[PDB]
Write a protein that binds this ligand. Structure first.
Ligand code: HEC
Ligand code: HEC
Ligand code: HEC
Ligand code: HEC
Ligand code: HEC
Ligand code: HEC
Ligand code: HEC
Ligand code: HEC
Ligand code: HEC
Ligand code: HEC
Ligand code: HEC
Ligand code: HEC
Ligand code: HEC
Ligand code: HEC
Ligand SMILES: O=S([O-])[O-]
Ligand SMILES: O=S([O-])[O-]
Ligand SMILES: [Ca+2]
Ligand SMILES: [Ca+2]
Ligand SMILES: [Co+2]
Ligand SMILES: [Co+2]
Ligand SMILES: [Co+2]
Ligand SMILES: [Co+2]
Lengths: 519, 519
């Protein structure tokens, strides 16, 4: 090889970048590391892009100076069970098939594994692209580094000649859409307007042909999702998160006004031909809660339906790219606010929300969050070295693998066995309430066809359908959320007991109605 | 089983015991645990003992209520190399046979092993009783609990019919005498007057037939050596220690007057027929430096000779039970204060001191000692229990076995590997200097016969004999001291460098004199 460009020349038309670049810890880092802009420079004016310069979005673009963080970022935790289906007695949600009915998640919902695989896994999961995309080889499942280097080096398209979403295997679904990708990659960061709105400068939008968009995307969880590449400063880039914090007025910590003042997101808008195009959110502190909260939150990234009239809410509507940014007890109200539900249960006919990994919103208010602990403290701490610069690890994983750093540094009276035991006590307890919430909800769901077939009245079914909304929300939050209660045990406990209460109620109401109908 | 005695009835005559017993943590502990005094009570007067009560001196007498401490006390560290001779390229003093000459230690000087064996190893070492006492079987070498229960359960006497010290094997010596036993056992605590003086009330004294004494003795390092059995309070019982510290006013920390004020021995004297018989030294705090310094010090416990006139100093003289109570740099002067040396080197003719394990006097003034660390902090810490009362371990051993407790609790920036490495750095460095001090001293010694045979003058010989005393002292201190410099690395270094300097001077004078003599 690389030959530096004259950055001062760049600054002549890129004051917004200069202001970020010259002030930060990348002041000495030349644009050529991340951009090829020779023809751009030859052809541009301050008012005309000329040739579009290339922006290198590979995490490997950072590995020439930050190999340690890159290597950690690419690493694979073999102990994290790969491709393990949750609808399964060995996993999170043994009754998930009954509970979720014909939702796309019924086609496959595996447990999470290492970050390196996130784009790949998104592409190949059975629910996403109808089986269109597949590992080139079952051997490829191990290759975290190959995945980081580019999805398409390890997976393949069954039919590169067509772009339509269809099933290639009988038990697959085509739930993927362009919004999904925002939590898998930011390769498209310069090609996607804020919120995924259609925009003249945006190749890709909420309404794009997701198969064509998929083909343009390569790298998982880009290094620049958390670090501004020009200033180095901590940031978020995820549109829905900025929208929640800023546009919705909710603040960084919606349940703590002081903390929302202590931890700040400063939006920065970049323009195209003078029009607002894309945004980022500069953090005043490297708050991993927000960094991780770009993805580990409950969201819409899918069409749905309006609670008011059942009208479809398709990808063209911003509500299909939305963070609720709310705890489990506020979720129903948040969803009601945007007049939105995900799906109608196939058996019971109840409009339902569909819950996805609400780790941040669960973590809010927990003792750990109340005390200033962030996701990275337990999942992504600094390495420990007798004689080394102690950099931050970059592939988040269970604190079980690093108990001294993750727990024992703070809990200095405990042994590693005790700390793990405290984890398991909570997880076990919660999992037991999940099993009971599933038992009861499944009972209620199973009673629906009996009720309908015995001629139970719409009024009664409609009451149960209402209960089903809260029973479902207050169960699924917990199979969706991946800490099995650890992140907020009192909350998991209250919520799951609520789900069970609702479900028992619906069962009693169904039973009474069936017995009456039959009498 | 045991029936409690009427303590009050004892207290009528035993007023000092009452004072100690009723006020401490053994107030509820009946005399019958440690004494069988029925015939005594029936026969005693205010002044005559009458029938002698039995005192149970086994550590096992404490085990009924202090099992944890007893079990730890009896435990055996297998990794402490057993019966390993120091005069050995694999051990402390490869040139020891040259350096110590005809001294008794030349018959055997093994490295220390676990406390449980101390009395047995004293009885059976080749230098002690002419090989009279032997393990009943080589199998018995592992039996630490057996040894604690009584030496004579695991060892035997080659000739119970005679009491004279003589060799039963060709390469043994009969170095033992009754003073030795004070650092192996206190079974004889009621049978030995303070200092081992001949005394009407003492069955055993400095001048006793040691073989007869030996047969009267059973247990190692009795629990009551450090704990008063009546009050439970920390104490010492070793006469020569109390003599140094209290009688001679040298203080518990003779190099630190302020510390000697803060750590104190309060003498308590017990009489027999109204004359002073035995003493203990009650500690104001449980300072294990003083507890351990009952044994881990440099001492006389052997006949020797006067520096002034060469006259023998036999067991009758109190100097044969003496704690020098001096660091390596003050030792020569302390030996002069008692006009004493141990042996004449068989080759050089030099009067020499014989140095034995001066761990405490080495420890004085070390960084750790200065910061109030004690022997037990590194060698006998509390056990660590997740869920138990954490008692003190009671078989002292290398901190290598228990680094978290011994080192890493105070040195929390260090890993176990780092703390060991620091240990090894000092031991290696020190060992290196001991090997060089050996090389030079041996070279000096070996030159003496060449000098003598060349006709070198007594004046030159005498001057090199004076050098030998210090060359020896500043060498042997360190093979005697079992930490290989760790206890005081800067002192070991200065002193070993002094030994070397003296030896090189000695060699230079002998070489010059031999050269002149031959020419
Ligand atoms: C004026 C003569 C320019 C100079 C000198 C440089 N750039 Fe530029 N650049 C310029 C314009 C008018 C635009 C378009 C802004 C808009 O309204 O859209 C750009 C764009 C970029 C981009 C983004 C391209 C994209 O994918 O949207 C990059 C990464 C970029 N420019 C980099 C860049 C570099 C590294 C330069 C020095 C080698 C440089 N530009 C000079 C105008 C001008
Ligand atoms: C890697 C460490 C980078 C270096 C060094 C430089 N740039 Fe950059 N740039 C980088 C990325 C990954 C992106 C995508 C957007 C994001 O925020 O991550 C960009 C973007 C730009 C743009 C477009 C900004 C916009 O209007 O949307 C421009 C104009 C730009 N970069 C210019 C630029 C210049 C001039 C640099 C040398 C001073 C430079 N970049 C260095 C990554 C990296
Ligand atoms: C060398 C040519 C680099 C490239 C390519 C990338 N980074 Fe960098 N980074 C570089 C330097 C010399 C420094 C300063 C280090 C220091 O000691 O001050 C940095 C710093 C960072 C930081 C942290 C700044 C801090 O707060 O300590 C980050 C987060 C960082 N760099 C990120 C990063 C990313 C994401 C990159 C790929 C887009 C990247 N760097 C490339 C040198 C270089
Ligand atoms: C979107 C770009 C994400 C960001 C930002 C963070 N995470 Fe993540 N995480 C994400 C996905 C899509 C997955 C599943 C990946 C797959 O292929 O299955 C994960 C997974 C995890 C895990 C589990 C890893 C394992 O060993 O199973 C953890 C512990 C995790 N994520 C935590 C985490 C932390 C602490 C983050 C901030 C530092 C973070 N994630 C950001 C998506 C994204
Ligand atoms: C950010 C708000 C995300 C959105 C948008 C999408 N996903 Fe996601 N995904 C996210 C996280 C934090 C995780 C790990 C936690 C968990 O429940 O696993 C995931 C995980 C996946 C996985 C791996 C596990 C699995 O379900 O098999 C896949 C295959 C996946 N996600 C696919 C997927 C699809 C198809 C999406 C659009 C409909 C989508 N994700 C969006 C974060 C986010
Ligand atoms: C959000 C999920 C992140 C992603 C994506 C990347 N990094 Fe990171 N990085 C993150 C955190 C929480 C931290 C620690 C910040 C703190 O002050 O506590 C870091 C730190 C760095 C650094 C600084 C040195 C260090 O502590 O290791 C560098 C140079 C860095 N990160 C680089 C980097 C690279 C190269 C990435 C892609 C491989 C990358 N980061 C992604 C959070 C996140
Ligand atoms: C320490 C108090 C933690 C905080 C801070 C965060 N998490 Fe956590 N998480 C924690 C535990 C003990 C567990 C269970 C892990 C185990 O081995 O049993 C988890 C689990 C997760 C997971 C699933 C990981 C896995 O099972 O391998 C994820 C995806 C996760 N946590 C994410 C996450 C987020 C996003 C956080 C900030 C909002 C966060 N965790 C903080 C402990 C702690
Ligand atoms: C007065 C009639 C006494 C009574 C009542 C008890 N004891 Fe005694 N004892 C007495 C004398 C005069 C002596 C000699 C020492 C002295 O204090 O002058 C002793 C000695 C002992 C000893 C030490 C024995 C030894 O081997 O040296 C012990 C252990 C002892 N006594 C115990 C003891 C007990 C337990 C008594 C109540 C059962 C008791 N004594 C009563 C005088 C008298
Ligand atoms: C073990 C826990 C004991 C208890 C209970 C009692 N005694 Fe004791 N005693 C014990 C030992 C090991 C010794 C030897 C000396 C020493 O200080 O360790 C003694 C000594 C005595 C003596 C002799 C004191 C002297 O003049 O030399 C007497 C008189 C004595 N003990 C009395 C005594 C009484 C009356 C007790 C019940 C109240 C008692 N002891 C309990 C061990 C233990
Ligand atoms: C039961 C009949 C016991 C006999 C035999 C021995 N000890 Fe004891 N000891 C006993 C009790 C009930 C207590 C008090 C426990 C408490 O903490 O309240 C003790 C205490 C001690 C102590 C500790 C004093 C302290 O400062 O904490 C010591 C050092 C002690 N005992 C020593 C000891 C010895 C050496 C024994 C054999 C001679 C012995 N004890 C026997 C109960 C009993
Ligand atoms: C206290 C001042 C002691 C006197 C009196 C005696 N010994 Fe000793 N001995 C003492 C300690 C602290 C140690 C461990 C340190 C060491 O140099 O090993 C020992 C060790 C022994 C051993 C075992 C190692 C060995 O030398 O083979 C034996 C066999 C031994 N001691 C015998 C012995 C003899 C024969 C004594 C009178 C001449 C004698 N010891 C006195 C402390 C003390
Ligand atoms: C000196 C070399 C000792 C020998 C001989 C015995 N013990 Fe001990 N003991 C010693 C120390 C340094 C300590 C810790 C004191 C402190 O305050 O830190 C102890 C402690 C005890 C206790 C108290 C409870 C505990 O800490 O474990 C008891 C009950 C005790 N020791 C009993 C005991 C027994 C039964 C012994 C013979 C088996 C014994 N001690 C010998 C030092 C020494
Ligand atoms: C005289 C009764 C002693 C008392 C009081 C203390 N120690 Fe000792 N120790 C003594 C001897 C005679 C020996 C040699 C034993 C043998 O048979 O060889 C020892 C040995 C040790 C050792 C070495 C243990 C090993 O595993 O090799 C250590 C570390 C030691 N001693 C330390 C020590 C401590 C800390 C003491 C006070 C708590 C202590 N000893 C007292 C003799 C005596
Ligand atoms: C911590 C700062 C210590 C203090 C306090 C005491 N000792 Fe020590 N000792 C220490 C070390 C690191 C070593 C070397 C052991 C090793 O494994 O390398 C020793 C050694 C001894 C030994 C020989 C033990 C053996 O090598 O197995 C003895 C007999 C000994 N130390 C005795 C002792 C005494 C009596 C103490 C108080 C005067 C004392 N030590 C304090 C570390 C420390
Ligand atoms: O599909 S993702 O949100 O788990
Ligand atoms: O001989 S003793 O002092 O080891
Ligand atoms: Ca959702
Ligand atoms: Ca000596
Ligand atoms: Co599993
Ligand atoms: Co999931
Ligand atoms: Co050895
Ligand atoms: Co020795």
């Amino acid at each position: 090889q690389l030959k530096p460009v004259d950055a001062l020349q760049c600054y002549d038309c890129h004051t917004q970048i200069e202001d970020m670049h010259v002030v930060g810890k990348h002041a000495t880092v030349n644009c050529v590391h991340c951009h090829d802009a020779t023809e751009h420079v030859e052809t541009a004016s301050a008012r005309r892009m000329g040739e579009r310069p290339v922006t290198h979005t590979s995490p490997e673009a950072c590995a020439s100076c930050h190999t340690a963080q890159f290597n950690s970022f690419a690493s694979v935790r073999h102990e994290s069970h790969p491709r393990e289906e949750k609808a399964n007695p060995r996993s999170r949600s043994p009754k998930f098939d009954t509970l979720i009915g014909a939702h796309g998640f019924s086609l496959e919902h595996a447990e999470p594994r290492s970050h390196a695989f996130m784009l790949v896994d998104h592409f190949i999961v059975d629910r996403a692209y109808g089986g269109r995309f597949q590992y080139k080889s079952w051997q490829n499942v191990t290759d975290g580094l190959g995945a980081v280097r580019g999805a398409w080096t390890v997976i393949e398209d069954m039919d590169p000649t067509t772009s339509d979403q269809r099933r290639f295997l009988a038990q697959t679904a085509t739930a993927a859409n362009p919004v999904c990708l925002n939590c898998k990659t930011q390769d498209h960061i310069l090609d996607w307007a804020y919120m995924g709105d259609e925009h003249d400068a945006a190749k890709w939008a909420r309404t794009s042909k997701v198969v064509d968009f998929a083909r343009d995307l390569h790298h998982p969880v880009n290094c620049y999702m958390c670090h501004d590449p020009h200033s180095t400063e901590p940031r978020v880039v995820r549109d829905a998160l900025i929208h929640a914090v800023v546009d919705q007025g909710l603040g960084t910590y919606p349940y703590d006004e002081a903390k929302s003042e202590h931890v700040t997101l400063t939006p920065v808008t970049f323009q195209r031909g003078g029009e607002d195009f894309r945004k980022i959110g500069l953090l005043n502190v490297a708050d991993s809660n927000l960094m991780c909260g770009q993805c580990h939150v409950e969201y819409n990234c899918n069409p749905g339906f309006q609670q008011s009239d059942g009208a479809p809410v398709g990808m063209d509507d911003r509500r299909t790219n939305h963070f609720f940014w709310a705890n489990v007890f506020d979720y129903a109200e948040a969803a009601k606010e945007i007049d939105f539900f995900d799906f109608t249960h196939v058996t019971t006919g109840a409009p339902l929300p569909k819950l996805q990994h609400p780790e941040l919103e669960t973590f809010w208010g927990s003792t750990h969050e109340r005390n200033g602990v962030t996701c990275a403290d337990c999942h992504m701490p600094r390495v420990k070295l007798e004689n080394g610069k102690e950099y931050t690890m970059h592939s988040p994983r269970t604190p079980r693998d690093m108990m001294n750093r993750a727990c024992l540094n703070c809990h200095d009276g405990w042994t590693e066995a005790e700390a793990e035991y405290a984890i398991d006590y909570i997880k076990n307890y919660t999992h037991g309430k999940i099993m009971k919430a599933e038992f009861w909800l499944a009972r209620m769901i199973d009673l629906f066809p009996v009720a309908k077939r015995a001629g139970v009245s719409e009024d009664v079914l409609n009451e149960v359908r209402a209960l089903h909304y809260d029973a479902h929300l207050h169960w699924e939050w917990w199979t969706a959320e991946n800490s099995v209660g650890f992140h907020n045990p009192d909350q998991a406990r209250e919520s799951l007991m609520k789900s069970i209460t609702k479900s028992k109620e619906g069962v009693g109401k169904l039973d009474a109605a069936i017995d009456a109908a039959v009498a």
